[PDB]
């Protein structure tokens, strides 16, 4: 009784309204992935904090050099 | 008429006055010749020793600053 618009259906992302045994199959299958993943990054969140000093250290160095460029040009 | 006092006779500035062909003719030629003075005299005039370490410098200070806002952000990270 789906062919007609007085026959009723359904909307898109109705199964976890219900609330059954695959809502609850669904919401907890999220928590088992993206609880693992979550220590992925905060491990690989003590390198990436350093490199973000090292890039800014790269520019000052960087830097120092146009400065030095600079300095010679006076000399 | 000149070769008497009593006839006209042309002074000196009287091509410039009358304001014709030949009198503007020859405004747009000290123009154009005294623009080109204007840059060789003044692309020479920027080969000034100590205004180059003045600009030596100011540059300088200026990468020191973006060096100390790094130092900071690093400082902030740790």
Redesign the interface.
């Given at each position: 009784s789906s062919d007609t618009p007085e026959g009723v259906r359904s909307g898109a992302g109705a199964v976890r309204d219900a609330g059954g045994a695959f809502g609850k199959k669904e919401q907890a299958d999220e928590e088992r992935y993206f609880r693992a993943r979550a220590r992925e990054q905060l491990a690989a969140l003590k390198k990436h904090?350093?490199n973000?000093?090292s890039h800014?250290?790269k520019?000052?160095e960087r830097?120092?050099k146009?400065?030095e460029r600079?300095?010679q040009?006076?000399k």
């Open positions: 904090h350093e973000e000093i800014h250290v520019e000052i830097l120092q146009e400065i600079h300095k040009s006076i």
